[PDB]
């Protein structure tokens, strides 16, 4: 919960926030079933299986 | 008077920036003068292309010189068509028409 | 400006569509500001975080 204010997108220098690294690792490590079938991801973000 | 333009140059583009200074010294006049603001950037990073663009629209430039790649060609044409600023470029031409 | 509006609001992920004339605007910003982007559009070629 990054309740610290994100600010604008035009930051000099633009700075990330390291809890964003936490989010995509959860997003890639999801294997559920949906309308198309087996939703299995890669490290890239593309679908496999 | 002194007018203000913006420059967008790739890192590794040594000769063109050298060719940019030779053009300014020769085509200078005594009456009206052009003032560049040069920026060096990666040109494939469309964030940095956007970041360099809006920084120079904050300066209030009259026209912009710069390059673009395949990654950034849509970024410029969507901006210059919206923000009504002119962009002069030696890059490959855009397919279709863009103001 | 619709991207920077929601990043000024602060979000954890963004769902949305892109097109061919806007895909590199997306894949540059999500690499920069580290905001994950889930989308049904055509697959980008390359290894995009």
Among B20, B47, B16, which Cα is nearest to C32's? B47
Query: Which residue is associated with the tokens 């936490």?
Result: A22
φ/ψ bin of B40: left (φ > 0), alpha (ψ from -120 to 50), beta (otherwise): beta
DSSP 3-state of B74: helix
E-strand stretches of chain B:
2-10, 33-41, 63-66, 86-88
Method: cryo-EM
Containing H/E element for C14?
Answer: strand C13-15
- Output the six-digit token pair for B70: 């395949």
* Distance between CA atoms of residues B16 and B70, nearest Å: 19
State which residue of chain B sits closest to C19, comparing Cα positions.
B74
Contact A17, C35 (CB under 8 A): no
Q: How far is B27 from chain A (nearest CA, A)?
A: 34
Instruction: Say whether residue A16 is in contact with chain C using an 8 A CB cutoff.
Output: yes
């Amino acid at each position: 919960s990054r309740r610290g204010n994100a600010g604008d997108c035009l930051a000099n220098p633009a700075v990330p926030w390291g809890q964003g690294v936490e989010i995509e690792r959860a997003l890639k490590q999801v294997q559920v079933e949906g309308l198309s079938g087996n939703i299995k991801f890669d490290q890239n973000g593309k679908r496999i299986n | 008077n002194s007018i203000q333009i913006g420059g967008l140059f790739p890192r590794g583009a040594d000769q063109e920036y050298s060719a940019f200074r030779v053009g300014m010294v020769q085509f200078s006049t005594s009456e009206f003068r052009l003032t560049p603001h040069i920026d060096n950037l990666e040109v494939a990073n469309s964030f940095a292309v956007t970041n360099a663009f809006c920084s120079q629209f904050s300066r209030g430039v009259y026209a912009i010189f710069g390059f673009y790649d395949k990654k950034s060609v849509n970024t410029i044409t969507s901006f210059c068509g919206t923000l009504h600023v002119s962009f002069i470029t030696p890059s490959f031409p855009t397919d279709g028409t863009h103001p």
